[model samples]
Target chain A: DDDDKKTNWLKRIYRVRPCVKCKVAPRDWKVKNKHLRIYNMCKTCFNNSIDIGDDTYHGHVDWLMYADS
Target chain B: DDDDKKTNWLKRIYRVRPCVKCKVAPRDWKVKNKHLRIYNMCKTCFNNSIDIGDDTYHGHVDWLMYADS
Candidate 1:
């Protein structure tokens, strides 16, 4: 039912959006702060730059600007 | 000569430094805007997120964070 749709939305939101360096596809993922809803990341970009996970090899890294993601 | 070294430095600087989304390698490309020299953007990440160029099909996208790359 709607739970499946809801879950799909969440996962789709996290999927990669294809960068120039990205071997992935679909760059439609976007974000909203104030008035600007700018497109930010693909899944790979998200995990790499935005999400400094609790673990890695995906080897530990940090971002200065957009890490708020 | 220093000229060769100089060009290499510039090109290297713009190169992708492996991201979670990146199929590239070497994520050691670091940046220093403050006391914190954070690592950001693989070549693909840079061109995709930062370099909202004079053109695309690379399909014209922009970043809300760290787009200064």
Candidate 2:
């Protein structure tokens, strides 16, 4: 179980990273393309740039470990 | 000058309020319509609902007072 937990946690880190536009770490939002590729984004960039309604699933980032790292 | 300061502070509060979509207070982003009418939104709603790139200016909210209120 611990191994599965560690693997899942690592996967989350890969899923959520810095914003591609602003390169700001600890991004709290995400946008996924039609290709199913997910991109991380901060609040400002998400609201100022990305179209979250156009097939983009926007939501919060898991910043628990990422914030400190 | 204190009167001006107070007026400006109150104006900021009026500009930023609960998200019209989610009704969550301490909204940190905004979207303006073609008529120059602005609406406040929280980070979650902004990412999940509103298209921030269409005539929307998104940024941080002054939650210094609203957080306590």
Candidate 3:
């Protein structure tokens, strides 16, 4: 199934990319923001933000930054 | 007013001292947590947590860390 294919693709990409935990994005994409994405975190490190009281949502800490694809 | 005095004191301190964004604490104090307040950021950068979907609060990203007095 496509879902399985995507999952496998992700696994392969992760293996090849060797991202460190939430430091890198799961996939690649061009960022339209002013910040430059490095390794994965952008200039602002906007993706590292997280709320302790929240559940079922990762919020700002969910993704590091968009890849410069 | 006391508030105005406090504000002036803060301005003077900021002018005399130095701060680079959220990297440093405003004052010197002691921290009892596992993370050390660098300029400000702690081990987990626990204070940097923020929720993106909600605009009600700044969340974890609000405070970087405590200082050692």
Q: Using lDDT as the measure, which candidate wins?
A: 2
Better of 2 and 3 by TM-score: 2
RMSD of each: 16.9, 20.1, 21.3
* Per-residue alpha-carbon lDDT of candidate 3 for residues A21-55, written as tens digits (9 for 90 to 100): 34554423243352212132222333433333322
Q: Please identify model 1 stretches exceeding 4 Å from their true place.
A: A1-69, B1-17, B31-36, B50-69
Model 2: CA > 4 A from native? A1-69, B2-8, B11-16, B29-39, B50-69
lDDT at A68 for candidate 2? Answer: 16
Candidates 2 and 3 compared by lDDT, better number: 2
Candidate 2 per-residue C-alpha lDDT over A1-69 given as tens digits, one digit per residue, 9 for 90 to 100: 223322443355445446655775545533233111223456676676655443232433221211111
Error of 2 at A11 (Å): 52
Ranking by lDDT: 2, 1, 3
**Chain A TM-score, structure 3:** 0.29
User: Candidate 1 has which clashing residue pairs, if any?
Assistant: A16-A43, A17-A26, A17-A42, A21-B44, A44-B21, B16-B42, B16-B43, B17-B42, B17-B43
What DockQ does each listed candidate score? 0.02, 0.01, 0.01
